[PDB]
From a paper:
A well-studied carbonic anhydrase II was selected for rational design as it has efficient CO2 hydration activity and could be heterologously expressed in Escherichia coli. Thus, to better understand the key factors controlling halophilicity in enzymes and to develop a halotolerant biocatalyst for hypersaline conditions, we undertook rational enzyme design by selecting just one of several mechanisms present in halophilic enzymes: increasing the incidence of acidic residues on the enzyme surface. Herein, we describe for the first time the successful redesign of a mesohalophile enzyme to an extremely halotolerant orthologue, that is, one that is active at 3 M NaCl and above, by altering 18 surface residues. In contrast to suggestions that large differences in accessible solvent area, non-polar surface area or absence of large hydrophobic amino acids are the important features that allow halophilic enzymes to function optimally in high-salt environments, we have found that increasing the number and distribution of surface acidic groups alone is sufficient to impart this characteristic.
Crystal structures of WT and engineered enzymes were obtained to confirm the presence of changed residues, that active site residue positioning was unaffected and also to compare the overall structural similarity of the designed proteins with that of WT.
Numbering used by the authors: 3 to 260
Write the structure that this text describes.
């Protein structure tokens, strides 16, 4: 089923083909900081990314992603709110049509310019697809991009976008350290949720970092010159690819260290 962020096939209509869009643990959410609860079971996050091996970058038609080699046991996410060990498979971003919107998660309704999603799958399920079908199968780390200074690490990613302008395009993208896109402080909010794109599976433990990384307004321009369409289709620039906040319903957002 074709979906996107346009007038006819956008977040407002996803429910027609993916009825879990109106499920009980949908993402993203607004994080009401006064309602955040502390939990002494929570641990510091362990993002063990030093041996993560990037492979390629791909315009998938809804955003772009950097693919990691998840056939080896090296780049893993553990601790934080998690039991067991999750392999890094890819990262991607969401952004908006102007600098003051574009994040998926919001903090007391504040939006950032963009949001990075580092996607991981629980090693006990063997692969990404199998893991995606279990409530404890995925873990996504979300990082806010706040407009300010130019980000040199981010620039390596943005430099490659000229190579992947349209849907299905890919380029070799070796040696990129995903940790170079994390803040120094790993304080986080966590809640049980879902993928923010169809198929919207409710299999994600969300880990949203409190501290953003920076991006310049000039860098933000680079995101918005990508195309949703394939070559030879009408041009639909990737001006915005964010889902609005979804009802928290009966969930609680936990915070570490508070
Ligand atoms: C619509 C609900 C399911 C969407 C998630 C896609 C998960 C795909 O799951 C994949 O399936 C393959 C074929 O069965 C298996 O070979 C893989 O091991 C599995 O990773
Ligand atoms: Na692959
Ligand atoms: Na290619
Ligand atoms: Zn995402």
């Amino acid at each position: 089923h074709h979906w996107g962020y346009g007038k006819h096939n956008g977040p407002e209509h996803w429910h027609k083909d993916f009825p879990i869009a109106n499920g009980e643990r949908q993402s993203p959410v607004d994080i009401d900081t006064k309602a955040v609860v502390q939990d002494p079971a929570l641990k510091p996050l362990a993002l063990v990314y030093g041996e993560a091996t990037s492979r390629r970058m791909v315009n998938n038609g809804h955003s772009f992603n950097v693919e990691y080699d998840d056939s080896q046991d090296k780049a893993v996410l553990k601790d934080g709110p998690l039991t067991g060990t999750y392999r890094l498979v890819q990262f991607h971003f969401h952004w908006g049509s102007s600098d003051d919107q574009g994040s998926e998660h919001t903090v007391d309704r504040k939006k950032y310019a963009a949001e990075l999603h580092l996607v991981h799958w629980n090693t006990k399920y063997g692969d990404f697809g199998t893991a995606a079908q279990q409530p404890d199968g995925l873990a996504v780390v979300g990082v806010f991009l706040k407009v300010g200074d130019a980000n040199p690490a981010l620039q390596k990613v943005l430099d490659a976008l000229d190579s992947i302008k349209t849907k299905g395009k890919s380029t070799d993208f070796p040696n990129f350290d995903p940790g170079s896109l994390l803040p120094n402080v790993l304080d986080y909010w966590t809640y049980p949720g879902s993928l923010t794109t169809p198929p919207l599976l409710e299999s994600v433990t969300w880990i949203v970092l409190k501290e953003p990384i920076s991006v310049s307004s000039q860098q933000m321009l680079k995101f918005r010159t990508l195309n949703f369409n394939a070559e030879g289709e009408p041009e639909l620039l990737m001006l915005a690819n964010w889902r609005p906040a979804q009802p928290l319903k009966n969930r609680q957002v936990r915070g570490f260290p508070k």
